[PDB]
């Protein structure tokens, strides 16, 4: 069928990002003037879906009052004639795009989010998309995945090439080359020592996945792992893993948050220009 459905899970304590995130989760950060959670609904919305599904945890305010309409905001903005911002916070929910609200429960982690959203997805194919995964590429990633699910009908993993050393982080696929951005897997490991790692290709916060998904999370014993029910399923039907054309800002990461700040902040329409020529000159 369609992706119509893209679930994003916005529970994370963000303990790197303290004191900012002790009444905000770490997906509302902004990089220059606009929520990391932001980027990746415009990007879904690039993409052709349009029913955002939110998994959310402590501090669910701040992530409801951002998407949900505020009378007061869109009235102040009206009566000073600001036309141009009253459609860009229009623009944050545009219509026929519909948000619904989901509670992390008790029991952590990216496997409970994907489960908690069971009943919502039902059984259709649905986007995951982690917003801490800040992706920079034309056409926006989910949208290349789309079109690649479109084609296959198949569950489709989004990956990059990593640094060989650095396998420890990574969710690390293997398989058979279809094309050239395209594998077909025969296994995916979680976080395997550089010397056992069977590829360079890391897992990143992009996944389109098939509702057949969900028996395998559910038969999981537990923290329950994402990774363990992918390599469930693939033994039942086709998985793919799809190099994406684009750049990726690690932004669970400080150090990955400050340099998508730079990044963005240079093609920033506003004041690319002049922080262009202040970080010239510091």
């Known amino acids: 069928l369609k992706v119509n459905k893209a679930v994003f899970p916005v529970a994370g304590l963000g303990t790197r990002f303290l004191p900012a995130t002790k009444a905000s989760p770490k997906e509302m950060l902004p990089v220059v003037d606009k929520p990391l959670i932001q980027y990746a609904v415009e990007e879904a919305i690039a993409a052709g879906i349009t029913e955002m599904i ?35 916070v229009r623009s944050i929910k545009p219509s026929h795009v519909d948000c619904f609200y989901v509670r992390q429960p008790e029991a952590l982690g990216l496997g409970h989010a994907v489960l908690c959203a069971e009943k919502l997805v039902a059984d259709n194919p649905f986007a995951v998309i982690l917003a801490d995964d800040l992706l920079d590429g034309n056409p926006p990633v989910m949208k290349q995945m789309v079109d690649v699910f479109d084609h296959y009908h198949s569950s489709v993993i989004g990956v ?62 537990p923290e329950l792992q994402l990774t363990d029910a992918i390599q469930a399923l693939l033994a039942d039907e086709q998985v793919l893993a799809y190099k994406y054309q684009g750049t990726r800002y690690d932004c669970g990461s400080k150090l990955g948050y400050l340099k998508a700040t730079v990044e963005f902040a240079l093609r920033h329409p506003e004041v690319g220009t002049e922080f262009d020529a202040y970080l010239r000159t510091r």
Do not use: Q
């Open 54 to 88: 939110f998994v959310t945890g402590r501090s669910k305010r701040a992530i409801e009052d951002h998407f949900d309409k505020s009378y007061e905001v869109e009235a102040e903005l009206e009566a000073r004639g600001k036309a141009k911002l009253l459609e860009l």
């Open 160 to 221: 990059e090439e990593i640094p060989p050393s650095e396998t420890k982080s990574y969710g690390i696929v293997d398989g058979k080359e279809w094309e050239e951005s395209i594998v077909k897997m025969s296994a995916i490991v979680e976080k395997p020592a550089p010397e056992v790692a069977p590829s360079n290709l890391g897992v990143v916060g992009r996944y389109i996945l098939k509702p057949r998904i969900f028996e395998h999370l559910r038969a999981l014993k």
